[PDB]
Design a protein around this ligand. Structure first.
Ligand SMILES: [Cl-]
Length: 259
């Protein structure tokens, strides 16, 4: 992925929160035009630019366009995040200010990965072995050969393996499974609501199972009603585990699947 390329940038921090990005900018002196790069948490293949100006943090999403280039909303396209940052060191072109000085990862600090990122490589290896039945040669060549296609596919299906995803079960069945055992606030699962890629969130709140529709928009972006848009369910779950953002509370412990 571009994220693997972006690891060679000393000011790329991987998947950190907005708040963690801001903490790093303070560490680096919060000087005008101080910036770092990180991974977009809701745009698949996306990045985010965090910049200090007037002792405030300014955050910009860098989207991966359909042709595979990189752009901030209403901006020009670039071959890479590195090229976008270089361009913005010479032209503000819509940003609050010039990108003056990168804030590098302090020593000890690597780019941060989420749960998806930590199982992505294993799932790609497994899919090649057990759908193209290689055990050597292409086993490794086929992975690198077809990395972009495999990353995109594994991104769209990696939820199916995750402990909070309970598959094609009804509202009534989901309520039954959440209500069994410990009544921990935020206990949750996601279920498939049809075959057209609609989903639902089931969330325990003061002993009541709340149900939230997760709908697919024109682009195939997922959201709860009036909520932030995500490319994948694993992005949505990471977000609402961090910030309630219109849910009555944050997601906590994944509901156990029938063993
Ligand atoms: Cl965030």
């Amino acid at each position: 992925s571009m994220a693997d390329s972006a690891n060679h940038l000393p000011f790329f921090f991987g998947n950190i929160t907005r708040e963690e990005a801001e903490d790093y900018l303070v560490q680096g002196g919060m000087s005008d035009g101080l910036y770092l790069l990180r991974q977009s948490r809701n745009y698949l293949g996306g990045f985010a630019l965090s910049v200090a100006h007037g002792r405030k943090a300014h955050h910009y999403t860098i989207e991966r366009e359909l042709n595979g280039t990189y752009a901030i909303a209403g901006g020009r396209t670039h071959a890479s995040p590195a090229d976008l940052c270089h361009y913005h060191s010479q032209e503000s072109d819509g940003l609050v200010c010039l990108l003056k000085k990168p804030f590098n990862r302090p020593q000890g600090v690597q780019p941060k990965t989420g749960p998806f990122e930590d199982l992505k490589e294993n799932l790609i290896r497994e899919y090649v072995k057990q759908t193209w039945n290689l055990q050597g040669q292409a086993l490794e060549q086929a992975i690198i050969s077809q990395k972009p296609q495999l990353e995109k596919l594994i991104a769209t299906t990696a939820h199916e393996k995750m402990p909070w995803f309970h598959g094609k079960i009804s509202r009534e069945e989901s309520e039954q499974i959440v209500l069994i055992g410990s009544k921990t606030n935020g206990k949750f699962l996601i279920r498939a609501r049809d075959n057209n890629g609609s989903y639902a969130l089931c969330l325990l709140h003061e002993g009541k199972v709340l149900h939230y529709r997760i709908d697919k928009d024109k682009t195939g972006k997922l959201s709860i009603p009036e909520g932030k848009k995500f490319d994948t369910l694993w992005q949505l779950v990471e977000h609402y585990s961090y910030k309630a953002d219109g849910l009555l509370r944050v997601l906590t412990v994944p509901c156990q699947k029938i063993g």
